[PDB]
Motif scaffolding. Structure first.
Motif, PDB file in Angstrom:
ATOM      1  N   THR A 195       5.700  17.973 -19.266  1.00  0.00           N
ATOM      2  CA  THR A 195       6.807  17.997 -18.311  1.00  0.00           C
ATOM      3  C   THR A 195       6.306  17.829 -16.880  1.00  0.00           C
ATOM      4  O   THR A 195       6.953  17.156 -16.070  1.00  0.00           O
ATOM      5  N   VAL A 196       5.162  18.443 -16.550  1.00  0.00           N
ATOM      6  CA  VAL A 196       4.558  18.296 -15.228  1.00  0.00           C
ATOM      7  C   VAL A 196       4.155  16.845 -14.990  1.00  0.00           C
ATOM      8  O   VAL A 196       4.378  16.296 -13.904  1.00  0.00           O
ATOM      9  N   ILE A 197       3.561  16.209 -16.008  1.00  0.00           N
ATOM     10  CA  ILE A 197       3.159  14.803 -15.919  1.00  0.00           C
ATOM     11  C   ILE A 197       4.373  13.911 -15.691  1.00  0.00           C
ATOM     12  O   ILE A 197       4.369  13.040 -14.813  1.00  0.00           O
ATOM     13  N   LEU A 198       5.434  14.129 -16.475  1.00  0.00           N
ATOM     14  CA  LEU A 198       6.638  13.310 -16.369  1.00  0.00           C
ATOM     15  C   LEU A 198       7.341  13.512 -15.034  1.00  0.00           C
ATOM     16  O   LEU A 198       7.906  12.566 -14.477  1.00  0.00           O
ATOM     17  N   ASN A 199       7.324  14.738 -14.509  1.00  0.00           N
ATOM     18  CA  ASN A 199       7.957  14.993 -13.223  1.00  0.00           C
ATOM     19  C   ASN A 199       7.129  14.440 -12.074  1.00  0.00           C
ATOM     20  O   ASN A 199       7.686  14.050 -11.043  1.00  0.00           O
ATOM     21  N   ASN A 200       5.804  14.394 -12.229  1.00  0.00           N
ATOM     22  CA  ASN A 200       4.966  13.809 -11.192  1.00  0.00           C
ATOM     23  C   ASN A 200       5.015  12.290 -11.210  1.00  0.00           C
ATOM     24  O   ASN A 200       4.808  11.662 -10.167  1.00  0.00           O
ATOM     25  N   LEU A 201       5.258  11.683 -12.375  1.00  0.00           N
ATOM     26  CA  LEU A 201       5.345  10.229 -12.427  1.00  0.00           C
ATOM     27  C   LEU A 201       6.615   9.720 -11.761  1.00  0.00           C
ATOM     28  O   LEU A 201       6.613   8.627 -11.186  1.00  0.00           O
TER      29      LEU A 201
ATOM     30  N   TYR B  63      14.423  23.339 -19.202  1.00  0.00           N
ATOM     31  CA  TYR B  63      14.360  22.689 -20.499  1.00  0.00           C
ATOM     32  C   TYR B  63      14.219  21.192 -20.280  1.00  0.00           C
ATOM     33  O   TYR B  63      14.974  20.596 -19.506  1.00  0.00           O
ATOM     34  N   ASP B  64      13.261  20.588 -20.968  1.00  0.00           N
ATOM     35  CA  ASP B  64      12.976  19.167 -20.837  1.00  0.00           C
ATOM     36  C   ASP B  64      13.323  18.500 -22.162  1.00  0.00           C
ATOM     37  O   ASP B  64      12.596  18.650 -23.148  1.00  0.00           O
ATOM     38  N   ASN B  65      14.439  17.771 -22.185  1.00  0.00           N
ATOM     39  CA  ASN B  65      14.929  17.127 -23.398  1.00  0.00           C
ATOM     40  C   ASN B  65      14.229  15.809 -23.704  1.00  0.00           C
ATOM     41  O   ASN B  65      14.679  15.073 -24.588  1.00  0.00           O
ATOM     42  N   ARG B  66      13.144  15.506 -23.004  1.00  0.00           N
ATOM     43  CA  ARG B  66      12.297  14.360 -23.278  1.00  0.00           C
ATOM     44  C   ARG B  66      11.121  14.731 -24.161  1.00  0.00           C
ATOM     45  O   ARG B  66      10.319  13.861 -24.508  1.00  0.00           O
ATOM     46  N   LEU B  67      11.012  16.003 -24.531  1.00  0.00           N
ATOM     47  CA  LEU B  67       9.887  16.537 -25.281  1.00  0.00           C
ATOM     48  C   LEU B  67      10.388  17.169 -26.568  1.00  0.00           C
ATOM     49  O   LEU B  67      11.353  17.937 -26.551  1.00  0.00           O
ATOM     50  N   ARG B  68       9.734  16.855 -27.662  1.00  0.00           N
ATOM     51  CA  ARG B  68      10.126  17.410 -28.941  1.00  0.00           C
ATOM     52  C   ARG B  68       9.598  18.840 -29.047  1.00  0.00           C
ATOM     53  O   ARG B  68       8.625  19.191 -28.374  1.00  0.00           O
ATOM     54  N   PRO B  69      10.256  19.704 -29.827  1.00  0.00           N
ATOM     55  CA  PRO B  69       9.792  21.095 -29.952  1.00  0.00           C
ATOM     56  C   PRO B  69       8.441  21.182 -30.642  1.00  0.00           C
ATOM     57  O   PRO B  69       8.266  20.710 -31.765  1.00  0.00           O
TER      58      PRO B  69
END
Lengths: 78, 46, 43
Positions: free
Chosen positions: A4-10, C17-23
């Motif tokens: 999530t940190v990687i995706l938010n920084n991109l 919550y990040d819905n781009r990531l699978r559990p």
């Protein structure tokens, strides 16, 4: 987590309206196809159906991250 | 006057309104009554 | 006011919550259990 940190920084300071190398060079896009089926070739309307998995790949120097994971595998959300 | 009064009333109704939750979400079931005014039955295809 | 508590629950579930990531992206394999109820087998 860290993905999530990687995706938010991109996506910070990112403009999806501009192609990579917008004033530098053309972007090279490599294309692949996988034909699932070629549908009925009816001559009445002069057409034919086809079902493919169209894959494109290119280089975007803005989506470059430093991490111990090598590849981000994502949905159609991004 | 009579318009901005209703505007503030509807804005009050819709502020802090959770659309994810039904009325009495953790309570008794909500009753829904149905009406149908049939305008036309177009084509019964066999 | 038994509607604010469930709103706070649903908002805490979706906070960060990040819905781009699978559990279980870094620890396990996401295992999806599937089911099909055919309500009508069409023509």
């Amino acid at each position: 987590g860290d993905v999530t940190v990687i995706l938010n920084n991109l996506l910070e300071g990112y403009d999806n309206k501009l192609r990579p190398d917008i004033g530098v060079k053309p972007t090279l896009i490599h294309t692949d196809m996988y034909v699932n089926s070629i549908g009925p070739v009816n001559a009445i309307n002069m057409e034919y159906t086809i079902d493919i998995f169209f894959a494109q790949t290119w280089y975007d120097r803005r989506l470059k991250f430093n991490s111990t994971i090598k590849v981000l595998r994502l949905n159609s959300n991004m | 006057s009579n318009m901005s009064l209703v505007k503030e009333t509807v804005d009050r109704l819709l502020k802090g309104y959770d659309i994810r939750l039904r009325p009495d979400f953790g309570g008794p079931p909500v009753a829904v009554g149905m009406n149908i005014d049939i305008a036309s039955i177009d084509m019964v295809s066999e | 006011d038994n509607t604010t508590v469930f709103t706070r629950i649903l908002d805490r579930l979706l906070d960060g919550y990040d819905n781009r990531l699978r559990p279980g992206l870094g620890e396990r394999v996401t295992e999806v259990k599937t089911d099909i109820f055919v309500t009508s087998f069409g023509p």
